[model samples]
Target: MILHAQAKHGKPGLPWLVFLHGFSGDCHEWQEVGEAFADYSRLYVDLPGHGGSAAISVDGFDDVTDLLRKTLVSYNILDFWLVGYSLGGRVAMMAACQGLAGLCGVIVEGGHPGLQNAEQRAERQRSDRQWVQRFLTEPLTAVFADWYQQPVFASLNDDQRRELVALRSNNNGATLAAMLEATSLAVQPDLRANLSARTFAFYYLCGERDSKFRALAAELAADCHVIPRAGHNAHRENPAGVIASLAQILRF
Candidate 1:
């Protein structure tokens, strides 16, 4: 399945950065961030069920990683750093744990390794199913109205919420539901055990205002960074802070 991608080539030898956007987000989500890191070649991909890549099928995390590797290979990209936000971050961690060759490092923003046990997984699956139903039955705007009301996005005001809703308006609801079911966190493997064993650098990043993930990052004992004054979507909410931390990570 050919995932839609956008690339920006940098100087002769700067490392490549492969970017993955969150669910409901397209490759265009990273346009500003990509430009901010203009010294490095960057590739932004729209995950399955989002943007032009909406029709692609993603069965599991491995499938997502396989598709990612294939897409990079097609571009003759063999070595790179990986960065992802929210759902994209979870996928990036899975790819890292599975051992992608030539991966310099990984940066996961607001991503999780999955629930710690079956009961938690079960509960999350049920919740995600409810979300799926809402996505399928309600208008996109209606779904987003409640979506931002969740604690993770509690920092967003009315205007920000409206902007986010508009940004996500292009999504195909059924496709989003399918993608969610296929890659639900409940079905995801517990990947926390693999973090320390990784050969490359790894960072768990979150917005300072996103208490849930901030605590999770601490629990994992990860090399973590908290972006000040931002919430779940730090890169969007505080790109300057996100880029500053990211630049430090990339050593640029």
Candidate 2:
């Protein structure tokens, strides 16, 4: 249950920087992001099946969060800033909600706050299960097709899109499916109710066209903002804008 992680920056006594990737992505997702803030102590953990970590627990984030807590204690890191993309962002928010002393602040991109209705949650669970099953049964080529075809990513040039599709295709479908199931937004507990109660700052940012999450960001962020011409993967598409946005947030 000890998640595998890599470090860059700061020193032994400095506060830790924690980063997590989206679904199917490994620790490398935040490699550039880590380097962007290289001055601080960084610790990027691979989600259960993605990087060097083992598969996710059957009980999902509850168990994963527990394991992460233990990992921090074991490593003796008491204070840390958390930044997560997609699924990783969801986990980071949950960890913050749990009121762990180690958490210094949280920044999330495109992470869901969870479904409010029981029926909606069940429907999403069923849908996600089917998505996972399709991944297990179909080849990566077809899967990549659907991933790229997401309307938000349609603006990318063919070559750019192809590269992304190939990278996603390289993943083990079964593992990705497991991830979808383990960390579905429907399953995540809503952190909105507790957002105002926390002492640490919460940053919610995402791609402008990614309506799904930009709305969420507005509802949660004290001073919300967006990247002009990017979607869910805005960091990769518009790093400068993302940096500018984050710098402003960190300042105030």
Candidate 3:
């Protein structure tokens, strides 16, 4: 269960910054952001079945958690700050709530803490199925269409948006389909209740224009900050803003 990792800065004994990438993203998801914060150590990991990690025998969030636990134990890493975007953010929050020792702080951007309601989860599951089908049957073009329509990404033009779709489409379709069927938000553990119970500092970040997670982040605390002129993948679209905020957080 060795995880693929890359480091940006070097500092022994200083709390490590463990980075998790979004869905359809590898360890490089936040590479640009990492470069901007080169003063602090950045450990970027590719989730199981995504980059150099072994494929999961099981599906859903729990499966990934099992894999992550093994990797962390094998590496003997502890006392780290976590920064995750989108699906990766979900992973970070899960780890935080589980009371993994030595965690300093957490930053989650555009991650849903599972369904606010069963009805909403059911509806989104069906929608995700349709999207999975079209992505499998139609091709990247059709998949990119609905993806671009997501409010978080609505700012990007057709060509700019398609490039991301193309980059993501590089993964095997069967794997992507399985992720949708098994790990859609519907299947996630309800984590909102666990948020307030955390002792480590937490920051709920999102783009000013990305309304989907804005309200959701508010429930975590009143300290949520909006990355100006950006969307879901704020670190990718607005590294300067991401760096400024994160640098202040880390004091590195």
Instruction: Using lDDT, give the best candidate's number.
Output: 1
In the range 103-167, model 1's lDDT, one tens digit per residue, is 99999999987788889998989999999998899999999888888888998889999999987
Model 2, 18-118: lDDT tens digits are 88888767888877656766566778888876767745544688777887787777667788878888888888888788766768788887777777789
- By TM-score, the best candidate is 1
RMSD of 1: 1.2
Sorting all predicted structures by TM-score, with the top scorer first, yields 1, 2, 3
Instruction: Let me know the TM-score candidate 3 reaches against the reference structure.
Output: 0.90
Q: What is the C-alpha lDDT of each candidate?
A: 0.87, 0.77, 0.75
For residue 51, give model 2's deviation from the true position in Å. 1.8
Taking all chains together, each candidate's TM-score versus the true structure is 0.96, 0.90, 0.90
RMSD of 3: 2.2
Rate residue 32 of model 1 by lDDT: 81
Candidate 1 stretches with Cα past 4 Å from truth are none
Candidate 1 vs candidate 2: the TM-score winner is 1
Ranking by lDDT, best first?
1, 2, 3
